[PDB]
Tab-separated table of N, CA and C in Angstrom:
chain	number	residue	atom	x	y	z
E	1	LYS	N	74.675	81.419	27.831
E	1	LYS	CA	74.129	81.905	27.009
E	1	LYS	C	71.831	82.500	27.028
E	2	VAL	N	71.790	83.596	26.048
E	2	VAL	CA	70.642	84.402	26.638
E	2	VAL	C	69.933	83.789	25.625
E	3	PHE	N	68.159	82.857	26.348
E	3	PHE	CA	67.696	82.306	24.559
E	3	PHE	C	66.175	83.151	24.736
E	4	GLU	N	66.538	82.746	23.347
E	4	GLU	CA	65.211	83.523	23.287
E	4	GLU	C	64.209	82.734	23.352
E	5	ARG	N	63.002	83.445	23.664
E	5	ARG	CA	61.818	82.671	24.125
E	5	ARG	C	61.408	81.372	23.271
E	6	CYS	N	60.821	81.597	21.825
E	6	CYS	CA	60.486	79.591	21.250
E	6	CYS	C	61.378	78.518	21.404
E	7	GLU	N	63.023	79.953	21.239
E	7	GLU	CA	64.519	78.831	20.717
E	7	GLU	C	64.002	78.330	22.041
E	8	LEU	N	64.074	78.403	23.260
E	8	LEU	CA	64.165	78.235	24.774
E	8	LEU	C	62.656	77.180	24.726
E	9	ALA	N	61.946	77.243	24.259
E	9	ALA	CA	60.433	76.033	24.524
E	9	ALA	C	60.486	75.169	23.221
E	10	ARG	N	61.622	75.295	22.139
E	10	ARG	CA	61.416	73.716	21.145
E	10	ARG	C	62.904	73.241	22.414
E	11	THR	N	64.000	73.686	22.826
E	11	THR	CA	64.789	73.479	23.531
E	11	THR	C	64.380	72.040	25.071
E	12	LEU	N	63.602	72.725	25.248
E	12	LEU	CA	63.389	72.126	26.700
E	12	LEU	C	62.140	71.060	26.059
E	13	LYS	N	61.261	71.159	24.973
E	13	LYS	CA	59.944	70.069	24.405
E	13	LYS	C	61.482	68.528	24.274
E	14	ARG	N	62.629	68.901	23.127
E	14	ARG	CA	63.514	68.052	23.009
E	14	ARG	C	63.862	67.338	23.952
E	15	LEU	N	64.120	68.148	25.348
E	15	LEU	CA	64.691	67.485	26.372
E	15	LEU	C	64.077	66.243	27.278
E	16	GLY	N	62.249	66.483	26.659
E	16	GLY	CA	61.518	66.173	27.152
E	16	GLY	C	60.927	66.918	28.326
E	17	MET	N	60.519	67.851	28.663
E	17	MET	CA	60.055	68.415	29.911
E	17	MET	C	58.828	69.247	29.228
E	18	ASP	N	58.341	68.765	28.386
E	18	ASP	CA	56.946	69.213	28.059
E	18	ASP	C	55.519	68.071	28.227
E	19	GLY	N	55.426	68.263	30.393
E	19	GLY	CA	54.306	66.816	30.728
E	19	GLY	C	55.268	66.585	31.519
E	20	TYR	N	55.759	67.128	31.490
E	20	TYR	CA	57.336	66.262	32.713
E	20	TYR	C	56.332	66.385	34.299
E	21	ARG	N	55.930	64.928	34.470
E	21	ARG	CA	55.849	64.596	36.570
E	21	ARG	C	54.518	65.619	36.053
E	22	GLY	N	53.673	66.001	34.866
E	22	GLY	CA	52.810	66.254	34.620
E	22	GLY	C	52.423	68.005	34.622
E	23	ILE	N	54.239	68.665	34.508
E	23	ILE	CA	54.750	70.136	33.970
E	23	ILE	C	54.254	70.561	32.727
E	24	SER	N	53.837	71.663	32.327
E	24	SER	CA	53.232	71.921	30.756
E	24	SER	C	54.461	72.257	30.804
E	25	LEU	N	55.174	72.714	29.432
E	25	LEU	CA	56.183	73.354	28.558
E	25	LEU	C	55.683	74.745	28.793
E	26	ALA	N	54.662	75.012	29.467
E	26	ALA	CA	54.564	76.799	29.405
E	26	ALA	C	54.691	77.201	31.194
E	27	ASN	N	54.402	75.739	31.675
E	27	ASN	CA	55.110	76.022	33.590
E	27	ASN	C	57.058	76.678	33.805
E	28	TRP	N	57.018	75.244	32.435
E	28	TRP	CA	59.029	75.314	33.036
E	28	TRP	C	59.316	76.646	32.130
E	29	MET	N	58.897	77.565	30.599
E	29	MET	CA	59.128	78.769	30.213
E	29	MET	C	58.721	79.575	31.480
E	30	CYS	N	56.954	79.527	32.032
E	30	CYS	CA	57.377	80.927	32.902
E	30	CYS	C	58.627	80.920	34.024
E	31	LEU	N	59.116	79.708	34.968
E	31	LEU	CA	60.126	79.449	35.040
E	31	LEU	C	61.271	80.271	35.341
E	32	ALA	N	61.387	79.402	34.058
E	32	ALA	CA	63.006	79.832	33.649
E	32	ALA	C	63.475	81.352	32.899
E	33	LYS	N	61.776	82.471	33.026
E	33	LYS	CA	61.882	83.296	32.342
E	33	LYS	C	61.951	83.882	33.478
E	34	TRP	N	61.435	83.838	34.738
E	34	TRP	CA	61.122	84.888	36.031
E	34	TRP	C	62.712	84.278	36.899
E	35	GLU	N	63.560	83.488	36.411
E	35	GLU	CA	64.561	82.837	37.416
E	35	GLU	C	65.288	84.167	37.247
E	36	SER	N	65.763	83.734	35.529
E	36	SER	CA	67.206	84.422	35.091
E	36	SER	C	66.611	85.045	34.034
E	37	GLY	N	65.537	85.316	33.176
E	37	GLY	CA	65.294	85.689	31.899
E	37	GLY	C	65.877	84.849	31.381
E	38	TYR	N	65.575	84.001	31.281
E	38	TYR	CA	66.417	82.738	30.137
E	38	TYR	C	67.999	82.662	29.818
E	39	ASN	N	68.424	83.174	31.211
E	39	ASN	CA	70.013	83.088	31.162
E	39	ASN	C	71.114	82.158	31.533
E	40	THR	N	71.416	80.818	31.179
E	40	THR	CA	72.493	80.219	31.492
E	40	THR	C	73.497	80.291	32.545
E	41	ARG	N	73.864	81.929	32.445
E	41	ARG	CA	75.115	81.788	33.321
E	41	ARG	C	74.795	82.794	34.566
E	42	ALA	N	73.126	83.169	34.460
E	42	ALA	CA	72.821	84.020	36.017
E	42	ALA	C	73.934	83.059	37.409
E	43	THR	N	73.574	84.470	37.913
E	43	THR	CA	74.221	83.540	39.484
E	43	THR	C	73.468	84.115	40.585
E	44	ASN	N	72.869	83.504	41.564
E	44	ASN	CA	73.180	85.120	42.751
E	44	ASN	C	73.161	84.379	43.573
E	45	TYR	N	73.820	85.317	44.414
E	45	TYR	CA	75.127	84.197	45.953
E	45	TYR	C	73.731	84.598	47.041
E	46	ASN	N	73.585	84.066	47.891
E	46	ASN	CA	72.461	84.454	49.099
E	46	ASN	C	73.413	84.733	50.110
E	47	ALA	N	73.631	85.776	50.476
E	47	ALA	CA	74.782	86.308	52.028
E	47	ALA	C	74.131	85.408	53.784
E	48	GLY	N	72.593	85.544	53.495
E	48	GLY	CA	72.436	84.849	54.279
E	48	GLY	C	72.652	83.206	54.829
E	49	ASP	N	72.213	82.409	53.992
E	49	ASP	CA	72.886	81.659	54.868
E	49	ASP	C	74.012	80.773	53.066
E	50	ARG	N	74.686	81.536	52.767
E	50	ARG	CA	76.138	80.794	52.391
E	50	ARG	C	75.828	80.021	50.910
E	51	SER	N	74.502	80.020	50.387
E	51	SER	CA	74.270	79.801	49.673
E	51	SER	C	74.676	80.089	47.830
E	52	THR	N	74.289	79.126	46.708
E	52	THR	CA	74.559	80.153	45.193
E	52	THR	C	73.280	80.086	44.398
E	53	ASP	N	72.640	80.440	43.884
E	53	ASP	CA	71.636	80.015	42.892
E	53	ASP	C	72.076	79.313	41.482
E	54	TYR	N	72.567	78.707	40.499
E	54	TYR	CA	73.575	78.196	38.846
E	54	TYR	C	71.960	78.309	37.983
E	55	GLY	N	72.391	78.645	37.295
E	55	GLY	CA	72.162	78.282	36.068
E	55	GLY	C	70.220	79.532	34.986
E	56	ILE	N	69.920	78.967	34.527
E	56	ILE	CA	68.885	79.170	33.632
E	56	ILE	C	67.672	78.829	35.001
E	57	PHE	N	67.637	78.022	36.321
E	57	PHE	CA	66.516	78.155	36.525
E	57	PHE	C	66.919	77.994	37.939
E	58	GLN	N	68.033	78.811	38.313
E	58	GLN	CA	68.750	78.734	39.411
E	58	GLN	C	68.322	78.209	40.720
E	59	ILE	N	68.516	76.889	40.421
E	59	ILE	CA	69.159	76.157	41.315
E	59	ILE	C	70.303	75.902	41.940
E	60	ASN	N	70.420	76.129	43.764
E	60	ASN	CA	70.261	76.100	44.853
E	60	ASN	C	72.201	75.264	45.031
E	61	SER	N	72.716	75.440	45.647
E	61	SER	CA	73.946	74.602	45.972
E	61	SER	C	74.258	73.992	47.629
E	62	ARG	N	72.732	74.539	48.082
E	62	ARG	CA	72.641	73.595	48.909
E	62	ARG	C	72.224	72.315	49.448
E	63	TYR	N	71.491	72.213	47.944
E	63	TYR	CA	70.761	70.598	48.713
E	63	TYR	C	71.249	70.483	46.740
E	64	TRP	N	71.134	70.782	45.642
E	64	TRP	CA	71.407	69.683	44.335
E	64	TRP	C	72.142	69.973	43.708
E	65	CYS	N	73.367	70.949	43.804
E	65	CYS	CA	75.137	70.655	43.257
E	65	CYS	C	76.014	70.866	43.759
E	66	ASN	N	77.153	70.937	43.239
E	66	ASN	CA	78.597	71.099	44.541
E	66	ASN	C	79.031	72.246	43.840
E	67	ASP	N	79.829	73.058	44.742
E	67	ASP	CA	80.158	74.202	44.116
E	67	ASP	C	81.106	74.343	45.038
E	68	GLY	N	81.461	73.253	45.915
E	68	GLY	CA	82.595	73.371	46.861
E	68	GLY	C	82.615	74.350	47.879
E	69	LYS	N	81.967	75.259	48.813
E	69	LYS	CA	81.994	76.262	49.161
E	69	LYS	C	80.176	76.944	49.991
E	70	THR	N	79.473	75.515	49.727
E	70	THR	CA	78.190	76.069	51.152
E	70	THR	C	78.249	75.092	51.763
E	71	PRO	N	78.247	75.796	53.273
E	71	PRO	CA	78.367	74.545	54.453
E	71	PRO	C	76.889	73.739	54.588
E	72	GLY	N	77.673	72.334	54.792
E	72	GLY	CA	76.731	71.332	54.900
E	72	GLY	C	76.221	70.856	53.949
E	73	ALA	N	76.557	71.510	52.541
E	73	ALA	CA	75.620	71.492	51.303
E	73	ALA	C	75.513	69.856	51.129
E	74	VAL	N	74.194	69.620	50.302
E	74	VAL	CA	74.182	68.161	49.466
E	74	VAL	C	74.306	68.314	48.412
E	75	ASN	N	73.987	67.643	47.162
E	75	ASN	CA	74.203	67.584	45.708
E	75	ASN	C	73.183	66.081	45.135
E	76	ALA	N	71.833	67.001	45.030
E	76	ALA	CA	70.431	65.449	44.854
E	76	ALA	C	71.172	65.198	43.508
E	77	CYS	N	71.803	66.304	42.223
E	77	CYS	CA	71.710	66.078	41.088
E	77	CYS	C	72.939	65.941	40.366
E	78	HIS	N	74.060	65.408	41.703
E	78	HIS	CA	75.501	64.568	41.603
E	78	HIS	C	75.893	65.687	40.616
E	79	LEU	N	76.089	66.706	40.217
E	79	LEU	CA	77.064	67.549	39.398
E	79	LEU	C	77.337	68.738	40.088
E	80	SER	N	78.672	68.662	39.008
E	80	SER	CA	79.141	70.315	39.871
E	80	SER	C	78.353	70.954	39.322
E	81	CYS	N	78.612	72.729	39.939
E	81	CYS	CA	77.162	73.650	40.202
E	81	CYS	C	77.860	74.416	38.630
E	82	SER	N	78.664	73.630	38.266
E	82	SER	CA	79.970	74.215	36.688
E	82	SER	C	78.679	73.724	36.088
E	83	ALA	N	78.160	72.835	36.049
E	83	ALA	CA	77.776	71.947	34.439
E	83	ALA	C	75.886	72.471	34.791
E	84	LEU	N	75.433	74.030	35.782
E	84	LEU	CA	74.517	74.161	35.493
E	84	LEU	C	75.026	76.036	35.146
E	85	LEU	N	76.119	76.243	33.950
E	85	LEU	CA	76.394	77.142	33.828
E	85	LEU	C	76.406	77.183	32.291
E	86	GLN	N	76.316	76.164	31.542
E	86	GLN	CA	76.855	75.859	30.046
E	86	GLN	C	75.559	76.056	29.413
E	87	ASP	N	75.826	76.279	28.214
E	87	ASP	CA	75.293	76.920	27.547
E	87	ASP	C	74.151	76.253	27.197
E	88	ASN	N	74.953	74.699	27.018
E	88	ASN	CA	73.947	73.383	26.752
E	88	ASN	C	73.008	73.224	28.248
E	89	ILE	N	71.794	73.465	28.372
E	89	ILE	CA	70.754	73.373	29.223
E	89	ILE	C	70.512	71.435	29.877
E	90	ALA	N	71.182	71.054	28.419
E	90	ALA	CA	70.886	68.804	28.949
E	90	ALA	C	71.241	69.037	30.428
E	91	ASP	N	72.746	69.174	30.881
E	91	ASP	CA	72.617	69.395	32.425
E	91	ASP	C	71.266	69.840	33.255
E	92	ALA	N	71.736	70.833	33.309
E	92	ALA	CA	70.344	71.976	33.811
E	92	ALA	C	68.740	70.936	34.335
E	93	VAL	N	68.375	70.527	32.848
E	93	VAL	CA	67.167	70.442	32.728
E	93	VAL	C	66.768	68.522	33.612
E	94	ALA	N	68.372	67.824	33.708
E	94	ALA	CA	67.932	66.727	33.980
E	94	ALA	C	67.925	67.503	35.229
E	95	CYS	N	68.693	67.563	35.770
E	95	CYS	CA	68.455	68.430	37.762
E	95	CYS	C	66.911	69.278	37.772
E	96	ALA	N	66.457	69.888	37.651
E	96	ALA	CA	65.576	70.410	37.537
E	96	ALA	C	64.338	69.504	37.094
E	97	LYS	N	64.658	67.909	36.643
E	97	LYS	CA	63.620	66.812	36.716
E	97	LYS	C	63.479	66.875	37.947
E	98	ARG	N	65.239	66.503	38.227
E	98	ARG	CA	65.138	65.345	39.852
E	98	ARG	C	64.590	66.128	40.617
E	99	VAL	N	64.762	67.953	40.475
E	99	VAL	CA	63.845	68.581	41.773
E	99	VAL	C	62.750	68.521	41.500
E	100	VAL	N	61.927	67.959	40.714
E	100	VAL	CA	60.661	67.880	40.781
E	100	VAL	C	59.998	66.616	40.700
E	101	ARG	N	61.198	65.659	41.381
E	101	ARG	CA	60.447	64.305	41.692
E	101	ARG	C	60.053	63.906	43.426
E	102	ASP	N	61.099	65.129	43.847
E	102	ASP	CA	60.637	65.868	44.702
E	102	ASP	C	59.024	66.047	45.174
E	103	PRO	N	58.804	66.384	46.745
E	103	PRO	CA	57.361	66.603	47.018
E	103	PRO	C	56.590	67.579	47.228
E	104	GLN	N	57.613	68.389	46.606
E	104	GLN	CA	56.768	70.078	46.770
E	104	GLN	C	56.695	70.363	45.037
E	105	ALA	N	57.494	68.874	44.361
E	105	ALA	CA	57.957	68.982	42.343
E	105	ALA	C	57.882	70.304	42.044
E	106	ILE	N	57.067	71.409	41.609
E	106	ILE	CA	57.371	72.695	40.716
E	106	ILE	C	57.458	74.138	41.783
E	107	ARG	N	56.757	73.194	42.652
E	107	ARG	CA	56.110	74.466	44.217
E	107	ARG	C	57.869	74.513	44.275
E	108	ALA	N	59.242	73.948	44.258
E	108	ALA	CA	60.208	74.226	44.880
E	108	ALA	C	61.025	75.208	44.435
E	109	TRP	N	60.530	76.319	43.689
E	109	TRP	CA	61.268	77.656	43.329
E	109	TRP	C	59.695	78.710	44.052
E	110	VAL	N	60.323	79.302	45.194
E	110	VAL	CA	58.943	79.852	45.342
E	110	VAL	C	58.611	81.111	44.177
E	111	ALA	N	59.818	81.347	43.756
E	111	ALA	CA	59.191	82.499	42.286
E	111	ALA	C	58.666	82.216	41.095
E	112	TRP	N	57.955	80.613	41.272
E	112	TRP	CA	57.051	79.969	40.571
E	112	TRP	C	55.559	80.160	41.235
E	113	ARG	N	55.522	79.886	41.960
E	113	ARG	CA	54.570	80.592	43.396
E	113	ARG	C	54.174	81.855	42.857
E	114	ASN	N	55.374	82.836	43.248
E	114	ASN	CA	54.764	83.877	42.609
E	114	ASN	C	54.652	84.935	40.906
E	115	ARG	N	54.899	83.886	40.582
E	115	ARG	CA	54.987	84.193	39.830
E	115	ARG	C	53.989	83.616	38.223
E	116	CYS	N	54.294	82.874	38.296
E	116	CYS	CA	53.640	81.352	37.843
E	116	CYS	C	51.959	80.749	37.999
E	117	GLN	N	52.297	80.722	39.520
E	117	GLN	CA	51.064	79.334	39.689
E	117	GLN	C	49.548	80.166	39.821
E	118	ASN	N	48.228	79.883	39.597
E	118	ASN	CA	46.936	79.948	39.252
E	118	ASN	C	46.925	81.335	37.931
E	119	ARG	N	48.208	81.544	37.233
E	119	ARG	CA	48.271	82.711	35.873
E	119	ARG	C	47.961	82.056	34.491
E	120	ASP	N	47.465	82.936	33.505
E	120	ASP	CA	47.565	82.593	32.737
E	120	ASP	C	49.394	82.040	32.065
E	121	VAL	N	49.761	81.454	31.361
E	121	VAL	CA	51.268	81.171	31.146
E	121	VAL	C	50.933	80.320	29.754
E	122	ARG	N	49.897	80.786	29.213
E	122	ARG	CA	50.161	80.334	27.485
E	122	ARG	C	50.183	81.073	27.050
E	123	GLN	N	51.194	82.801	27.150
E	123	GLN	CA	51.190	83.227	26.251
E	123	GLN	C	52.814	82.734	25.986
E	124	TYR	N	54.050	82.333	27.021
E	124	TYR	CA	55.238	82.012	27.195
E	124	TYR	C	55.022	81.067	25.492
E	125	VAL	N	54.455	79.453	25.445
E	125	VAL	CA	54.663	79.049	24.574
E	125	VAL	C	53.882	79.517	23.017
E	126	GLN	N	53.206	80.429	22.874
E	126	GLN	CA	52.725	81.094	21.860
E	126	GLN	C	53.072	80.965	21.025
E	127	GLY	N	53.193	80.337	19.097
E	127	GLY	CA	53.337	80.239	18.507
E	127	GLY	C	54.709	79.051	18.126
E	128	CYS	N	55.684	78.957	19.041
E	128	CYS	CA	56.607	78.356	19.009
E	128	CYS	C	56.859	77.517	18.470
E	129	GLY	N	55.711	76.371	18.162
E	129	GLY	CA	55.586	74.714	17.468
E	129	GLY	C	55.801	73.794	18.085
E	130	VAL	N	55.106	74.084	19.539
E	130	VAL	CA	55.671	73.212	20.192
E	130	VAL	C	53.988	72.755	20.967
């Protein structure tokens, strides 16, 4: 599913993401926007290390979910990577929360550092009623 901007903002809010571990909803929107264009079925293979990024937040198979084909990978969110390709983002949100409970928090995603950090992200939630 490809979410429309405000549709996703309210969906994330309902899921408890607004201010989760100090991360504003606007930051999560900026992350999903740059990672997948709000697309839950997006996938990106990384030929260099044999891992794959899954779903709306492009969560990597090396450390977060199990796809059974990534060498010596672990599964910190304890989910099948398939769970990250659902139209319903509840599991992807639970996993994204798991990711930010680590030392780097939101900085775990390089795309967030490149396109969201120290930037005006207000735009992402404007007019969405969140």
